[PDB]
Every structure is written in C-alpha cells, then in structure tokens.
Amino acid sequence: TCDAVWFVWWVNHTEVTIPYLATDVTCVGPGAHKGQSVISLDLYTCELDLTNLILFSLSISVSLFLMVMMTASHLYF
C-alpha cells in the first residue's frame, strides 16, 4: 500500500543485493494489487509535499473573500 510510499520507492532506486526481487517477493494486497512484484511498483496515490492543503486553503480563502467583498459592495451600494 501507499502507507509507506518511500518503501515502494526504496526498492526502485537503491543498489542492495536482494535476490528474487520480481517473482518471489510479491504483494498480499490490497485487492487489485495482489500478486504484484515490488520492483514493478510505483504508487503516486499519496499526496506529495503538502501542496494540496495549500491549494484548498487558497481556494476557500478566495471564495470567502469574493463573497465578503460582494456582500460589502451590495451593502455600501
């Protein structure tokens, strides 16, 4: 799973002698990712550096700011 995403990355770019890396060490889950090899794994599921929170905060701030500005403009005519 993505819970240890860097683990999925650690097997990709690291020179450590791990035999049977593509046919024996497999995945138990979850669901559609059963039987997958660890070397052929790449999980972009987890958000990376927290830019999603920045974008969400910016969007809600812009929305509330436009709302407040338009309400104040209507009140002030």
Partner: protein, 483 residues
C-alpha cells in the same frame, strides 16, 4: 427626436437578453461542474484499492454517507431561512451566494476530510434551494421586464402605467425558459466531460466488474444489489487528478465571475424599500399562509413528481438499467444521450406555443408513462451485448419527457402568478417540494421497485392537472390576499 429612445430601448432589451443568457450559462456551468465532481467522487470512493491506499483507516464510507445526509436533509431547514435571505440580499446576489457556496463545496474536495466536507455539504444543501428559487425568480422578472419594455416601446400611451401585460407575457417568457432549460440540460452533458477524458480510460472491462449480477432491471431489489468490490484497473496518478480538479475549480470560478459581472443590476432599490414596507415579522409566515391557496393543493403533487422523476432519471436509468448490459464504459454516453434528448425537447416545447397552455403537459404525462410500462415488463439481461440502442432510445425519450415537463411547469408557474412576491413564494414552494421529493427518493433507496410508485404519482398528477384546468375554466375565482 424619436430614434434616441428607440436605440435606448433596443440596448436595454439586448442587455436584458444577454443578462438572461449569462445567468443561464453560469447556472448550467456550476450545475455541470457540481454533478461531474459528485460523480467522480462517487466512482472513485467505491473501491477497496483507492480507499485503502489513499486513506485506509479514515472512515471513507462514513464520510460519504455523512456528506449525502448533509446534502439531502439540510434543504428542509433551508426552507425556514430562504425568504428573508432571498429578500435581504436580492434576486441576483442570491445566485452569486449560491455559486460561491458551490465553488466552496468544489474546493472542499481537495483535502477530503470530515471537518471540511461535512460543513461544505451542509452549506450546499442549504443553498441548493435558494439557488433555484433566485434563478426562477430572476428569469421570470427579466422576462416580464422584457415584455413591458417591448410593449411600452410599441405602445407609448396605450400601455397603462400600472399592470401592463394582463397575462400577455407568455410568448416572451416561454422563449427564455426554453433556452434556459436547454442550457440546464446541456449541463448534464458537460458534467460527463471529466469522466470521459480522465475516468473512462482507467476502469477495466465489464467481464470482471459486472460478474456477481445475476438479475437486474425489474428485479433490482435496490440501487446496486450485485456488484464487484473494485472497479478501477489502474490507479490514477495524483497529477492527473489534481489537474482535472484544478480545471473544474477554474471553470467554476469562470462561471461565478460571469454570473457576477455579466448580470449588472435589475433590482431597482425602489422595489427594495417597497418590500421593506411589509416587515420581517410577516415574511416568515407568508409562505405558510399561502397554503390556503387552491392551486397549490393540486400543484404540489406535480412538483413532487418532478423531483421524483429527475432523481429517477439521474440514478434509476443509469445505475438501474444502463449498468446491466454495459458497465461504467457507456454510462457517461447514456447520460449525454439523455442530455441531448432533453435539449431537443426544450426546442420541441418551444415550438408548441400556438397551442393553449395545458397541451404538452398531460401529453408528457403519457409518453414517459409508456416508458414506465417498458420499465415494468421488459428486463434486459446483464451478461449479454445484444441490444444497445434500446437503452439509448429509452434514455432519449425519458429526457424528452422530463425536459418538456420542466419547461411546461415553469411556463405555467410564470403565467399563473405575475407579482414579484407571488412569483418568489411560488418558486420557493416549488423548490422546497422538489427538495422534499429528492429527500424522499433518498430515503426510498434500496427498495424493491420504484416504477409502481412512479406510475401512481404520474396518474395522480394528471388527474390533479385536469381537475385544476376544468375548475379554472369554470371560473372558480379564488385567490389569497396577503399584501
């Protein structure tokens, strides 16, 4: 000098027309982005893979259920606060507040947590009814202003200073309502663009996700009884998801800005200070006092049936019949076919103007009724790809019926009431009853069948409409007076 006033009135008419067009465009754009985001979230949050790798121990089904509850229940409380809010902000500012709340809900789907999705869903359910109320009131008011402008330009001294139209604004309101509903129905088609361009290429075939479906159609026994646990073949990269959500946010922002800028002001603060002469201690009871109206007691089932049929066309045909033969590959295509059928029915009902008012309405009450029969006896086998055009033509005919029903209802509500407060109250009651019908269908989920209830409701609606027509022709002469 007479050409100056002529050009002034022509420019005012063009401004009214472009304001109506921009309002309809913004409404359809925000409705489309909302529907697309809701569909993408409903499809993406129904799988063990995504839920367990992105969130895992986060309670994603609980969050989805709480969001659905906050969206489908809060309109009831929204009725209690919608009249004072729609008469305090204005007719246009309410649309801006609603599209802003919609943009807030669209933004709250970025981080996707409980404390950010529950209040957003509550606000969306609180604003869904005032949005439609303000939209209908603004459309009707702009149509009446267009009519009185044209009649004062063509008749200077012949037009009375007070009450110009005398029930002659139907050809000028129907033409606007036709394009309004055409845009609102093309909104359903525009809602399927992200799913087609990003989600339709990530799910595997129907041979694995439609395996445990032994019986469907008439033997539904629920919204989705038999279905596989997973639906996505590969997991979508966070880059594609974030870029499509940013595109959705940008198009919602553009819709909100075009609603704000390309509308101007059509309120006339004289009407504001006239409305303030009524007070606040009576506006809270005015919609509760209009219950004694005779036309409402027969038009309420019409509104309940409108809500029931729109929610059955949104879910019952796509997730009940269109999911049998084909999986999620042609669901967006079925929805866009429904949308094109409804858009064609908009112009079809626009063409039916020379005939009297209650001609297509009951006609609609028959056509989809026939479809109900087809939806009662015929049951498609899910694990065969034999006939695919039957679902297409069924969705097209159902969209035609729904669109003609909606435009006839709107034209009847616009021609039956002409006062600004009267139109506001009628639209508020209509949208409250539509939200009640939506909530009832939400509670009526996971049941045996909903076609018998549909045909019973449409029969009762046809009977009530015929009764109202035959009593209005006999001149009953009943109307409430609460100035």
């Amino acid at each position: 000098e007479e050409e100056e006033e002529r050009r002034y009135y022509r420019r005012k008419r063009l401004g009214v027309l472009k304001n109506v067009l921009a309002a309809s465009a913004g409404g359809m754009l925000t409705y489309g982005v909302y529907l697309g985001l809701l569909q993408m979230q409903l499809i993406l949050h129904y799988d063990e893979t995504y839920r367990e790798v992105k969130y895992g121990n986060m309670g994603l089904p609980d969050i989805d259920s709480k969001m659905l509850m906050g969206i489908n229940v809060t309109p009831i409380a929204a009725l209690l606060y919608t009249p004072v809010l729609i008469r305090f902000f204005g007719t246009k500012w309410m649309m801006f507040l609603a599209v802003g709340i919609y943009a807030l809900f669209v933004s709250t789907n970025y981080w996707e947590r409980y404390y950010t999705l529950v209040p957003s869903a509550v606000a969306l359910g609180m604003a869904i009814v005032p949005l439609w109320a303000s939209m209908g009131n603004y459309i009707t008011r702009m149509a009446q202003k267009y009519h009185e402008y044209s009649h004062y330009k063509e008749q200077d001294g012949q037009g009375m200073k007070q009450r110009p139209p005398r029930g002659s604004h139907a050809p000028y309101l129907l033409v606007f309502q036709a394009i309004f509903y055409s845009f609102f129905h093309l909104s359903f088609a525009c809602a399927q663009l992200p799913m087609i361009y990003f989600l339709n290429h990530y799910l595997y075939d129907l041979n694995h996700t439609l395996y445990n479906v032994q019986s469907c159609g008439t033997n539904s026994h629920g919204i989705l009884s038999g279905f596989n646990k997973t639906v996505l073949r590969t997991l979508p990269r966070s880059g594609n998801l974030i870029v499509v959500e940013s595109v959705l946010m940008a198009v919602a922002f553009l819709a909100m800005l075009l609603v704000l800028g390309l509308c101007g002001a059509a309120y006339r603060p004289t009407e504001e200070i006239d409305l303030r002469s009524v007070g606040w201690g009576n506006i809270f009871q005015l919609p509760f006092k209009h219950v004694r109206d005779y036309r409402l007691r027969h038009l309420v089932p019409f509104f309940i049936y409108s809500g029931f049929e729109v929610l059955f066309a949104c879910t019952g045909i796509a997730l009940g019949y269109g999911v049998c033969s084909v999986g999620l590959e042609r669901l967006a295509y079925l929805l866009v076919a429904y949308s094109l059928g409804a858009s064609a029915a908009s112009l079809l009902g626009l063409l039916g103007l020379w005939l009297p008012r209650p001609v297509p309405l009951v006609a609609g009450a028959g056509v989809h009724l026939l479809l109900t029969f087809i939806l009662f006896f015929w049951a498609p086998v899910p694990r065969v790809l034999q006939h695919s055009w039957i679902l297409y033509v069924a969705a097209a005919l159902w969209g035609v019926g729904s669109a003609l029903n909606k435009t006839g209802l709107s034209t009847l509500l616009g021609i039956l009431y002409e006062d600004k407060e009267r139109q506001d109250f009628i639209f508020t009651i209509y949208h409250w009853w539509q939200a009640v019908a939506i909530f009832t269908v939400y509670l009526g989920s996971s049941l045996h069948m909903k076609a018998k209830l549909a045909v019973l409701l449409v029969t009762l609606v046809a009977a009530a409409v015929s009764y109202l027509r035959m009593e209005q022709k006999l001149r009953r002469g009943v109307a409430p007076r609460q100035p």
